[PDB]
From a paper:
WSCPs are a class of non-photosynthetic Chl-binding proteins from plants. These homo-tetrameric proteins are present only in the plant family of Brassicaceae and contain only one Chl per monomer in symmetrically related and structurally identical binding sites. Interestingly, different WSCPs are characterized by different relative affinities for Chl a or Chl b. To this end, we coupled a crystallographic approach, solving the still missing Chl b-reconstituted wt structures (Chl b Lv-wt and Chl b Bo-wt), to a Raman investigation focused on the carbonyl groups, with the aim to characterize the (possible) H-bond in which the carbonyl may be involved.
In a previous detailed mutational study, the comparison of these two [name] variants allowed identifying a small 4 amino acid-long motif (-LCPS-) in a loop near ring B of the Chl as the source of the marked Chl b-selectivity displayed by Lv-wt17. From the inspection of the available crystallographic structures, the observed differences in Chl selectivity were attributed to the possibility of forming an effective H-bond between the LCPS or PVCNEL motifs and the formyl group at the C-71 position of Chl b17. In Lv-wt we found a main peak centred at 1652 cm−1 and a minor feature at 1678 cm−1. Taking into considerations the experimental and fitting results together with the assignments from previous works, we can attribute the intense peak at 1652 cm−1 that is present both in Lv-wt and Lv-L91P to the stretching of the H-bonded C-71 formyl group. In Lv-wt, this component is predominant, and this could be the consequence of a direct H-bond between the formyl group and a peptidic nitrogen, as this is expected to lead to a rigid conformation, with a well-defined distance between the H-bond donor and the acceptor. The remarkable Chl b selectivity of Lv-wt17,38 can be attributed to the presence of an appropriate H-bond partner pre-oriented at the correct distance and orientation from the ring B of the bound Chl, as evident from the comparison of the two structures, to give rise to a strong interaction. Thus, the shorter 4 amino acid length of the [L/P]CPS motif provides a more rigid binding site, whereas the longer PVCNEL determines a higher heterogeneity in the surrounding of C-71 in solution, which can be attributed to a higher flexibility. The combined approach of X-ray and Raman presented in this study led to an update of our interpretative model of the Chl a/b selectivity in WSCPs, highlighting that the rigidity of the surrounding of Chl’s ring B in Lv leads to selectivity either towards Chl b when a suitable H-bond partner is present (Lv-wt), or towards Chl a when a H-bond partner, such as water, has to be incorporated in a sterically hindered binding site (Lv-L91P). Crystallization of Lv-wt Chl b was performed by hanging-drop vapour diffusion adapted from conditions previously reported: 6.0 mg/ml of protein in a 0.1 M Na/K phosphate buffer (pH 6.0) with 3.0 M (NH4)2SO4 and 4.7% sucrose.
Numbering used by the authors:
A (entry chain D): 5 to 27, 31 to 66, 73 to 139, 144 to 179
B (entry chain C): 5 to 27, 31 to 67, 73 to 138, 145 to 179
C (entry chain B): 4 to 27, 31 to 67, 73 to 137, 144 to 161, 165 to 179
D (entry chain A): 4 to 27, 31 to 67, 73 to 138, 143 to 161, 169 to 179
The structure:
């Protein structure tokens, strides 16, 4: 099944989208704690009209339950690593962090339908769903223990940036 | 004559708008230099899809051109001890527009006037509001005159839904 | 009403720079207490072992004596906040953080230096003693007299 | 190859903490050079007069001698960047900032301590040899590869 944006249109690669909580504003880079500034975690901004930092998806169609990479799109980057999402294996909390390799399997996630709402999804990694936990700046994306139910998943939509 | 938003609808008081450059993204609070963190200047973010921090307009519900208004940022968090209302830093050589003004005092009053080319395009006048290079990017400053649109920073108002 | 002494056993002088160093990381420095405000500033113990702290000068409403009204003012060539460098109590707060921006001549900014424990050149600030709580950067000074919950300090003369 | 001396005129030891302080603000510390990056870090003179600097240890690739390959490594219980505390040259900057994140065993991280001018116990760093100087950066003077930036070593404690 093709992933759809908030307008019900199918997701394309090489196309800028805000990832916005379906459940404050969009998802942005921020540090998870005071122990490291780089690499960056993924936090929901508490500011209501901030749309989030845009991402592009790499594989023109994006389909559900398929290996994809998510890369922030930004003209400025304060860290010496990449803008591609990945899992902090060395973190005892398994934060989703930047600095992944867009071609490597370390950076692969899958987009799956969430609950009933249309155009609502979750991310799953290999199967563990992406949830959230309290961090310094607010809720940060973390890898949950499993993907048995949507209970612990952080529901998202994709909004096309024009 | 009523000020209009990007949809051509007239501006209302107590209504959130993005002030967006007509000439990066919207206008946001940021420090102008390394000498002070508070109060805050008004900077154009270089990030292309950042809409700006919303403002509300007050009158000392219609907003009309060439009339005294106050501009106040709207935000659930504020890192400085002073107000979210725009004003002129009289004590700076640059005459930065800064936060921390009194919305009821005349120090915080600006006027919205039509700007050159393009529908629903405006400038602020107190002397027109222009911009200069600052630490984080272009910061709003009060110019010398309002003789022409040359030095004015053109803006539009986009309704926040 | 005996003189407060520095780590060299010399009596404290007014208008003289001292590091206030925890008597039990490095010295006391200005830092934000939480993510809700940058200004005004709280008083935090740096976790860095050889950072001496930001110097303060003491004023009196030349000896600094115990159990006497004094004001503490940070000494620095730059200040990123619009208010003063004088310590005071955040009168309306939960933890009653000690914060900058006080008036050194006003009673709002008065503290008293008293002996702490049965030790040597060790003190506390005070009815209510100055303690600490966990904050963003580390321990921050808060207003709590007994030396149970007091934050013990010493004074090191700066040269 | 004569021994480098600290501010007390005592010879420098390897694996010993020193402040590197400008020979005539306070000591040298890690800080960002500009708004383009937080990591890795530059080497800046703090403008605060009583800040001694962040301590370093010197390693040899127990006396530290002049005109010999040495590595400089900051010593700290915390580090906010994902790389090492060892000094090196930012080859891919036009300023050639001295930056952290070097390999203490690689030749990229080797400097030499040479006597500077007249003052006793005063030195410069050299990496044909190029001396370490300074340029204006965001917070203040930052060390760059080229006068030289004269330094002294103060024993911690
Ligand atoms: C590597 C350092 C880094 C840090 C520390 C942060 C931190 C933050 N980012 Mg991120 N980012 C960082 C890198 C990057 N970000 C982004 C892109 C974005 C976007 C698009 C957004 C964020 C936002 C946020 C904020 C999310 C929480 C919040 O809503 O607070 C509530 C908000 C505030 C308290 C206002 C903060 C104002 C100012 C932007 C930062 C404050 C300046 C002071 C230095 C604060 C430092 C305080 C210290 C003591 C902790 C948070 C301040 C969101 C945000 O709210 O920004 C306005 C947001 O929309 N970031 C990019 C791509 C350009 C980065 C590149 O390296
Ligand atoms: C009080 C201090 C204060 C400071 C220093 C800033 C600083 C900034 N604000 Mg502002 N703000 C501050 C107060 C507040 N802001 C806001 C609301 C906003 C909004 C909505 C936005 C800003 C944005 C900005 C940035 C505009 C420049 C840019 O385009 O960068 C390009 C972006 C970067 C260089 C990445 C910066 C990411 C991150 C937020 C952390 C930056 C802080 C650093 C870790 C510390 C210093 C690092 C240096 C070396 C870069 C700039 C970093 C804009 C922005 O871009 O934010 C993401 C923006 O959209 N501010 C509020 C209301 C809550 C404030 C209330 O106090
Ligand atoms: C709002 C302004 C302001 C803020 C946020 C701080 C914050 C801090 N001061 Mg303070 N200060 C501030 C104003 C002032 N300080 C000082 C003088 C001092 C001195 C002398 C010292 C401090 C120190 C500290 C630090 C204590 C915690 C620690 O031990 O970390 C330990 C060290 C680290 C965690 C490494 C990172 C340090 C780096 C300078 C912070 C970088 C900020 C991040 C890039 C932003 C990311 C923040 C995230 C949360 C958003 C803390 C970072 C102490 C310190 O440790 O300095 C290094 C210290 O010795 N301050 C003066 C007079 C000049 C100020 C005047 O305005
Ligand atoms: C991103 C990482 C990082 C950044 C941005 C800095 C930045 C700085 N360090 Mg460094 N450091 C950083 C990493 C680390 N430092 C250190 C250890 C030290 C030491 C021991 C010292 C520094 C000091 C400094 C300052 C030197 C310039 C000065 O004299 O300011 C003058 C001081 C001020 C202007 C007031 C202090 C500012 C306050 C700490 C926070 C400033 C951040 C702003 C509130 C946020 C907004 C930023 C601006 C751009 C809008 C400078 C602010 C020196 C210093 O002065 O600290 C107080 C210093 O003594 N650093 C360690 C080991 C723990 C790090 C590990 O990662």
């Amino acid at each position: 099944e093709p992933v759809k944006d908030t307008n019900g249109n199918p997701l394309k690669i090489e196309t800028r989208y805000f990832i916005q909580p379906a459940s404050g504003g969009g998802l942005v880079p921020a540090n998870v704690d005071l122990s490291h500034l780089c690499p960056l975690g993924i936090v929901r901004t508490s500011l209501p009209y901030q749309p989030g930092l845009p991402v592009t998806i790499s594989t023109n169609d994006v389909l559900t339950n398929t290996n994809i990479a998510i890369t922030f799109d930004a003209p400025i980057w304060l860290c010496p690593s990449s803008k591609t999402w990945t899992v902090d294996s060395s973190s005892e909390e398994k934060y989703i962090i930047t600095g992944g390799d867009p071609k490597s399997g370390e950076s692969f996630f899958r987009i799956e339908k969430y609950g009933n709402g249309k155009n609502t999804y979750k991310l799953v990694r290999y199967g563990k769903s992406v949830g959230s936990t309290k961090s310094l700046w607010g809720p940060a994306l973390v890898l949950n223990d499993d993907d048995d139910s949507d209970e612990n998943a952080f529901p998202i939509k994709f909004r096309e940036v024009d």
